[PDB]
């Protein structure tokens, strides 16, 4: 439906804190706010972004009570994102640094939201604060604002510098603080925002706070925004009559960019000056150009062309007799293995809704499929159009959801087997043990997953799943560059992109010496 995000940006004096020589937090917060608003203006979402800018010299409010709501300035309210906000974020080289407090921006944002909402409702309310935690505090209104946020449902997400408690770039999935950043103002602000966040929502109050290291390189800003899916109703059968009313939804799939490149003509800047044609010109000689009404869709057979184009094939095609989510057979032996899955999507088949006797029956079915490695072969069709398909229904036993996941399977035209030579009993290409230990030193210096934290559960370095997509990011920043400065040539790529896609540092430094070992012992490469 409609979404609403309110961005609080500190402009306070210690937010106008200096730089040691590595990176600067005011620039970091500028990069994160412009990342969010370029996504919102380039995805055409029906939503509103607002700014609450606190720390400027000026005071702009309907009510500014003494020292509270001082250094409160507004520039753009809840509106659809546009290039005006990018102008506001690019024409803000000045801090104008003075701060009264940072605990007034929240209540004035809630007030202007509630006194401006009429006729145009929302299905989420998310406010993100960007502060480096050094200015003063005031706990005049604590429980009344906790109950006001608990009875108005204003969820909030908090952003902090890279100091939590060799050359740190932006964040390379390593240690966040260089050495030290904790003071008493950091302490008091951290505990008051912690206690308002737990007294609003619970345990995530200790976990929905994010640094500028891991907010650029992760989609934690992109939570409680997106709309879920389209509810899929179907019906599962076993045998004669096990007609379970079922809901299906999609899951991980290939992402495609929606905008297209409209071809225009130069020196006019209008579209209508293109009228493309094609002629179905049987020349084979001096040229004869024919009209449409001549075309038989001929196929190839053996060594020739055979006629009969379409209404006859539209009659004598395969009749598809309706959609189906039927069950063909079963197998206790889990012999559908990983290298045969072969589809371009995965389908979470969930449960029933609405008098869920069918859903408790399905949970009984997967709670029977759980105990042994028993697989289920399920035949799918979307509609009359789609070809029918076989697939496997994996069970999924998780914490707050018990689901089944549908993957496709090959038909026996889509395989091919071909003999490749063996490498175990190969009398020519067997290695040496010092070569083997060079490989093992390279592995154990380049390993990323080890167990720690005294309970020996696994911690992994560089989890290659949480990365945002770089392609639409690069494309969208290049378009905003070109539509901002309308003659400059294109940049090279940003450096926080490679600061996102880098492997961490200590693993490279550990591998530096076995990489020298493999280079120095293994034989020549061309």
């Amino acid at each position: 439906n409609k979404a609403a995000v309110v961005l609080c940006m500190d402009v306070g004096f210690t937010m106008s804190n200096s730089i040691p020589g590595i990176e600067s937090p005011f620039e970091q917060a500028k990069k994160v706010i412009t990342m969010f608003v370029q996504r919102q203006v380039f995805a055409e979402n029906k939503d509103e972004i607002a700014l609450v800018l606190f720390g400027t010299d000026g005071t702009d409010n309907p009510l500014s009570g003494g020292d509270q709501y001082q250094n409160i300035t507004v520039h753009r309210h809840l509106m659809l994102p546009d290039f005006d906000l990018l102008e506001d974020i690019e024409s803000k080289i000045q801090p104008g640094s003075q701060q009264a407090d940072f605990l007034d921006a929240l209540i004035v944002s809630m007030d202007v939201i509630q006194h401006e909402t009429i006729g145009k409702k929302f299905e989420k309310r998310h406010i993100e604060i960007f502060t480096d935690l050094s200015s003063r505090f005031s706990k005049s209104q604590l429980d009344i604002i906790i109950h006001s946020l608990k009875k108005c449902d204003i969820s909030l997400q908090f952003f902090l510098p890279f100091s939590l408690g060799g050359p740190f770039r932006l964040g390379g999935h390593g240690p966040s603080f260089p050495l030290k950043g904790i003071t008493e103002q950091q302490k008091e602000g951290l505990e008051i925002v912690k206690m308002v966040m737990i007294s609003l929502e619970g345990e995530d109050g200790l976990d929905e706070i994010y640094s500028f290291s891991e907010s650029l390189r992760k989609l934690c800003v992109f939570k409680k925004i997106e709309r879920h899916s389209i509810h899929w109703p179907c019906r599962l059968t076993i045998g004669s009559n096990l007609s379970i009313r079922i809901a299906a939804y999609k899951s991980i799939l290939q992402e495609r960019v929606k905008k297209t490149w409209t071809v225009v003509d130069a020196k006019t800047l209008k579209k209508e000056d293109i009228q493309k044609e094609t002629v179905y010109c049987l020349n084979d000689d001096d040229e004869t150009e024919v009209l449409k009404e001549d075309i038989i869709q001929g196929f190839r057979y053996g060594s020739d062309i055979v006629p009969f184009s379409k209404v006859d094939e539209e009659q004598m095609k395969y009749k598809s007799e309706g959609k189906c989510f039927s069950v063909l057979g079963f197998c206790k032996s889990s012999q559908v293995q990983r290298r045969f899955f072969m589809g371009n999507q995965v389908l979470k088949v969930f449960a029933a809704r609405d008098d869920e006797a069918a859903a408790v029956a399905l949970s009984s079915l997967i709670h029977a499929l759980d105990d042994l490695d028993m697989v289920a072969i399920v035949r799918y069709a979307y509609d009359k159009r789609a070809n029918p398909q076989v697939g496997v229904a994996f069970p999924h036993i998780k914490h707050n959801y018990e689901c089944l996941v549908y993957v496709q399977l090959p038909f026996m035209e889509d395989l091919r087997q071909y003999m490749f030579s063996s490498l175990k009993n190969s009398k020519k290409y067997a290695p040496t043990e010092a070569q083997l230990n060079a490989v093992d030193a390279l592995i154990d210096s380049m390993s990323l997953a080890k167990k720690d934290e005294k309970t020996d559960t696994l911690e992994d370095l560089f989890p290659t799943t949480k990365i945002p997509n770089p392609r639409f990011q690069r494309l969208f920043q290049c378009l905003l560059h070109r539509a901002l400065h309308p003659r400059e040539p294109l940049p090279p790529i940003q450096q926080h992109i490679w600061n996102m896609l880098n492997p961490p540092a200590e693993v490279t430094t550990k591998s530096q010496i076995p990489l020298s070992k493999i280079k120095t012992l293994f034989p020549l490469i061309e």
Binding site: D273, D284, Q297, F299, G329, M342
Partner: protein
Amino acid sequence: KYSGRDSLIFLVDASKAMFESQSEDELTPFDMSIQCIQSVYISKIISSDRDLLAVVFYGTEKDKNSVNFKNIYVLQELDNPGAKRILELDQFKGQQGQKRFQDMMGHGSDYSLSEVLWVCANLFSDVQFKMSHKRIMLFTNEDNPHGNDSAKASRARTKAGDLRDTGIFLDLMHLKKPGGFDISLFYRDIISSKLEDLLRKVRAKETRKRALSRLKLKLNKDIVISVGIYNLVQKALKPPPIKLYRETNEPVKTKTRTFNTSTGGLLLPSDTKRSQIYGSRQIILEKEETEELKRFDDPGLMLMGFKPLVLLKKHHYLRPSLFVYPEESLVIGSSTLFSALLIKCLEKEVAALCRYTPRRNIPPYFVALVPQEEELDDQKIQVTPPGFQLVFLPFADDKRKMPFTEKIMATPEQVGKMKAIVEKLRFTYRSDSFENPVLQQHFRNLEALALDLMEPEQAVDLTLPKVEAMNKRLGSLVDEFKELVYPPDY
């Protein structure tokens, strides 16, 4: 070789009692052989449509051959499977075909000896190509055809030895004169029954082999290795729909242009630019600009860490999975580094993590390399080759969000019933044979135009459930599993 082609000569023994009904009113072996030959052609005209297929009847009354012998009649020559060849050949079906072959060539004579194998050798020698398979399909039923003259037996085994020398091999597909395989005779001197391969089993396949990319994996910056990235599960589909003129029955050869700039005229690649609109403001760019804004790296694989095989859930996949193998265009020894890396990654169950840029300008993509050790057996059950395998990994807007906030518990009165049900339905999986209904009926429907026999032919689809054989096999516990704890009760 890659552009190699194979070859097959059908040598038919229609001489003495094979043209008779064997005094049996059950089956006729001439019509059986012509049905098997029609099945072979009618499969390989869409399966493997480039080999060489010839048809030769011997023991006939007339003769037709380029050395000009007697009793030997070649019919067609080594070429593609053709609709003309099968529409010509199916005039010898049944007793009407028996009489038509009688009047067209006749039947019965003192048949040949070595000379028919001489005709086969002079049929293979003419072809200027690269023959890779040299097989002869013999359709005969007698098993001592020269059992009164030993000079012809010695000359026939001599000439068959000299055909075995140059690389010709014959497999006589035995007709059923005694029905069962009771002719345990002494025909071991020439050779190197079951007909079901020639009968049914291959109505929709293909044959091909390429490599799809030859890229290089770089470990640090200087240690490079060369891998061919094969594809092994490929999603075949129906061929492209050729366009055709109505009257002269020829392709159309379309052409395409662009004009009408509020003046008319005609345009070029340079006059026009690319563009986009975003709400109110419009961007314009060049074709090189919109092709260069997606430009990251160079083609190849880049080693970016290591991980053991425990974090990746098979909930997570995106596309099909390729297969990387140690090729031979960097150095003699990249195989050896891959063999050492294979052994260590398998025994410490570790899997590589890489970035992968497929060709000259594509954004990069994270893959995970999982090893695979081969499996063969006594009788060479070469089911796996040894080498590494890609798995793709999602990024950000792949994983969507469900409604997902639903969690209700059931009762454990159903688990034993369902265990009995799934043990009732248990079948050991498959190895092959789950063929495609849409492509299959398209094959049959295209048979029924250039072969135009009657109608759309047989169209069984081995992907339907059989509820009639499911109900009796399950039994009458459907009602008790439907209403043991839970009534719908409207």
